[PDB]
Amino acid sequence: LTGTGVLTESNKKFLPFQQFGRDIADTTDAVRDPQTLEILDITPCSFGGV
Amino acid sequence: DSTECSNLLLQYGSFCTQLNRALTGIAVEQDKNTQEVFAQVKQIYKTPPIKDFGGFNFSQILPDPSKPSKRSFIEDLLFNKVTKFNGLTVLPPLLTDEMIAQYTSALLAGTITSGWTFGAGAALQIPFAMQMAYRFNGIGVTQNVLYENQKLIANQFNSAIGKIQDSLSSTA
Amino acid sequence: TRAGCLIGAEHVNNSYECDIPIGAGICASYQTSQSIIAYTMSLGAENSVAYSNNSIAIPTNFTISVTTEILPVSMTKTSVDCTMYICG
Amino acid sequence: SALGKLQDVVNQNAQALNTLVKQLSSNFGAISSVLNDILSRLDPPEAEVQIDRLITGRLQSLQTYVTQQLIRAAEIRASANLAATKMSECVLGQSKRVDFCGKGYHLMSFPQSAPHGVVFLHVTYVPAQEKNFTTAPAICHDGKAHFPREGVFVSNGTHWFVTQRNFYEPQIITTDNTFVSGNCDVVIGIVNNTVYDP
Amino acid sequence: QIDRLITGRLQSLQTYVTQQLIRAAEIRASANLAATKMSECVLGQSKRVD
Numbered sequence: 246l247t248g249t250g251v252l253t254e255s256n257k258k259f260l261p262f263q264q265f266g267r268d269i270a271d272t273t274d275a276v277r278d279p280q281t282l283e284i285l286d287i288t289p290c291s292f293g294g295v
Numbered sequence: 296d297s298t299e300c301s302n303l304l305l306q307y308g309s310f311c312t313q314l315n316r317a318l319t320g321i322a323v324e325q326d327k328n329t330q331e332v333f334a335q336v337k338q339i340y341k342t343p344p345i346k347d348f349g350g351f352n353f354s355q356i357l358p359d360p361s362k363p364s365k366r367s368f369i370e371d372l373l374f375n376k377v378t379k380f381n382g383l384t385v386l387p388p389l390l391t392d393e394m395i396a397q398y399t400s401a402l403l404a405g406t407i408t409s410g411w412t413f414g415a416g417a418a419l420q421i422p423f424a425m426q427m428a429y430r431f432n433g434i435g436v437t438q439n440v441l442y443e444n445q446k447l448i449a450n451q452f453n454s455a456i457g458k459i460q461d462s463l464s465s466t467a
Numbered sequence: 468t469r470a471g472c473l474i475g476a477e478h479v480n481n482s483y484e485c486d487i488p489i490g491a492g493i494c495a496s497y498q499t500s501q502s503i504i505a506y507t508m509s510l511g512a513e514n515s516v517a518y519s520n521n522s523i524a525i526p527t528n529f530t531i532s533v534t535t536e537i538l539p540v541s542m543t544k545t546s547v548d549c550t551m552y553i554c555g
Numbered sequence: 556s557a558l559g560k561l562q563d564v565v566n567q568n569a570q571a572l573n574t575l576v577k578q579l580s581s582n583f584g585a586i587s588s589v590l591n592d593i594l595s596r597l598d599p600p601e602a603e604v605q606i607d608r609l610i611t612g613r614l615q616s617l618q619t620y621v622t623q624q625l626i627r628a629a630e631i632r633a634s635a636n637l638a639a640t641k642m643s644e645c646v647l648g649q650s651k652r653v654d655f656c657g658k659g660y661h662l663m664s665f666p667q668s669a670p671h672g673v674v675f676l677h678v679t680y681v682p683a684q685e686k687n688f689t690t691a692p693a694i695c696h697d698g699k700a701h702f703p704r705e706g707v708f709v710s711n712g713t714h715w716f717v718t719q720r721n722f723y724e725p726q727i728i729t730t731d732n733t734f735v736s737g738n739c740d741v742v743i744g745i746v747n748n749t750v751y752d753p
Numbered sequence: 754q755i756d757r758l759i760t761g762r763l764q765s766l767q768t769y770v771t772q773q774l775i776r777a778a779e780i781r782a783s784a785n786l787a788a789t790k791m792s793e794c795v796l797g798q799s800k801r802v803d
């Protein structure tokens with residue numbers, strides 16, 4: 246997977262075989278780092294109107 | 296996140312501006328609706344001290360001062376029963392829940408203490424028993440019917456309030 | 468604020484009427500020197516009623532007051548030719 | 556700047572017309588905006604395709620315009636029905652609906668013509684400066700409870716009177732302003748006084 | 754391909770805007786009814802049956 250977003254260290258536990266999770270809207274939310282077995286979070290940066 | 300897509304979309308015309316104006320009109324009407332429904336009183340009337348309202352127990356609709364929220368028990372039940380991805384933004388409302396609660400409390404205090412005179416001129420205090428007697432005189436019956444049955448009327452009112460609370464807490 | 472970031476206005480611990488609405492209860496106005504302020508809107512002036520077991524307030528005078536209410540009725544009647552519009 | 560509700564309709568109509576006119580000068584994907592220059596320097600099939608593109612674009616624009624006009628006409632018809640009801644029950648009679656035909660007690664209204672609208676002049680009745688008194692449910696004279704016929708039992712500190720609920724006109728409490736019903740044992744707050752018999 | 758995607762997404766957005774306009778009109782009618790019921794019943798005594 247690819248994309249652009251703010252990476253943050255989350256705390257949701259994953260299964261030993263799963264790699265990346267999604268949401269109800271089918272969007273990339275959390276991805277496990279390939280090297281270290283840590284669960285990260287993917288959140289888009291701020292956006293709005295002026 | 297595409298520049299060529301935007302350059303292609305610029306050839307279609309002014310549809311984005313139209314839909315944005317439509318959504319802005321919807322958003323401003325959503326606040327005008329509540330600002331017209333709830334904000335109908337000028338002065339915020341406060342509840343008096345310990346009250347002998349003839350025998351009626353208005354302890355389930357007045358604002359509960361225990362919790363910081365100015366919502367009553369029925370309002371708490373009603374709030375507890377009802378339960379940033381691709382450019383979608385949820386604009387916050389203009390009036391918070393606390394302002395709506397204060398408006399409802401002011402309206403309730405005005406209807407209890409003054410009656411029906413706080414919607415035309417200045418608030419005029421009057422005993423609640425005489426207010427109910429005037430209501431009964433408006434529905435057809437005389438004042439003696441209430442002056443001789445105020446106890447039964449207050450008991451039935453308390454029972455009805457309790458039944459309403461039970462029905463709201465049981466099913467929604 | 469609770470509706471974003473307000474850059475250019477100063478906060479104040481007062482409560483006036485809402486002149487320029489912002490959101491989440493926060494309102495702005497132009498008052499005195501002169502600058503742009505941001506305050507929490509006030510719903511109204513506190514007016515406690517002197518209720519008791521035996522007390523009634525009866526007015527003694529009256530004031531006639533004429534008001535004004537405007538309501539739209541109709542619009543402009545238009546008609547566009549589809550063929551002449553699409554095809555020149 | 557008080558007649559803004561009437562000006563908003565004209566502003567929206569003008570904005571819609573200007574948007575339509577500006578959409579008449581778009582491409583939606585083509586070689587040019589004007590249609591004759593498309594067929595001038597181009598082969599028949601590609602010119603027809605580019606004309607079909609503009610046809611689809613203008614059809615979509617006109618459909619959106621008609622939809623917006625219908626949505627606006629619905630609200631305008633609702634407002635016109637409200638204005639007709641408020642014209643019926645304001646002038647051809649005295650209404651008792653609170654805060655409907657004017658703020659306060661309604662007396663009369665006068666209609667006035669306006670461009671694409673109507674202006675009402677609600678003549679209301681607003682109370683004035685108050686005056687505190689002391690009230691009582693009934694009055695006991697000879698073991699019988701006397702209730703006020705139409706008014707309140709008002710006392711100025713020393714004596715008792717009876718006046719209407721909308722104006723202070725103290726009258727002498729007599730048997731022509733009260734009716735006897737029951738005895739002085741049930742009314743909570745029964746006061747003692749003397750009812751005058753003419 | 755981008756033109757086809759743009760047309761599809763614009764049609765979807767227009768349908769969404771139309772549905773939102775209809776729902777907003779319904780909500781405005783309901784709010785007007787609620788305001789009438791609040792002004793003619795709470796701040797007085799109505800003689801309208803039911």
Ligand SMILES: *[C@@H]1O[C@H](CO)[C@@H](O)[C@H](O)[C@H]1NC(C)=O
Nearest residue numbers: 261277278279280281282283
């Ligand atoms: C992968 O290599 C990194 C070196 O930066 C090391 O820290 C990590 O523990 C290694 N992971 C495994 C599973 O060997």
Ligand SMILES: *[C@@H]1O[C@H](CO)[C@@H](O)[C@H](O)[C@H]1NC(C)=O
Nearest residue numbers: 346350351352353354355453
């Ligand atoms: C009113 O009802 C509440 C319900 O718990 C009760 O605590 C309170 O004592 C009642 N007050 C009167 C005056 O009956």
Ligand SMILES: *[C@@H]1O[C@H](CO)[C@@H](O)[C@H](O)[C@H]1NC(C)=O
Nearest residue numbers: 526527528529530683684723
């Ligand atoms: C009511 O107010 C007007 C205005 O000052 C005054 O002229 C009139 O005398 C007042 N009425 C009474 C009964 O005092």
Ligand SMILES: *[C@@H]1O[C@H](CO)[C@@H](O)[C@H](O)[C@H]1NC(C)=O
Nearest residue numbers: 517522686687688689711712
């Ligand atoms: C109520 O009326 C009494 C006189 O009967 C007066 O002394 C008192 O000030 C009045 N209270 C208010 C709040 O107007």
Ligand SMILES: *[C@@H]1O[C@H](CO)[C@@H](O)[C@H](O)[C@H]1NC(C)=O
Nearest residue numbers: 710711712713714715716725
């Ligand atoms: C009350 O009104 C009566 C009128 O008969 C008057 O004689 C009396 O002095 C008044 N009392 C006071 C306290 O003003």
Ligand SMILES: *[C@@H]1O[C@H](CO)[C@@H](O)[C@H](O)[C@H]1NC(C)=O
Nearest residue numbers: 347519520521692743744745
């Ligand atoms: C409360 O109202 C009742 C009814 O008129 C009256 O009998 C009683 O004296 C009043 N008590 C107080 C403390 O005002």
Ligand SMILES: *[C@@H]1O[C@H](CO)[C@@H](O)[C@H](O)[C@H]1NC(C)=O
Nearest residue numbers: 695698739744745746747748
């Ligand atoms: C009214 O008179 C009766 C009998 O004379 C007496 O029992 C009662 O206490 C009196 N009420 C007052 C308020 O003085």
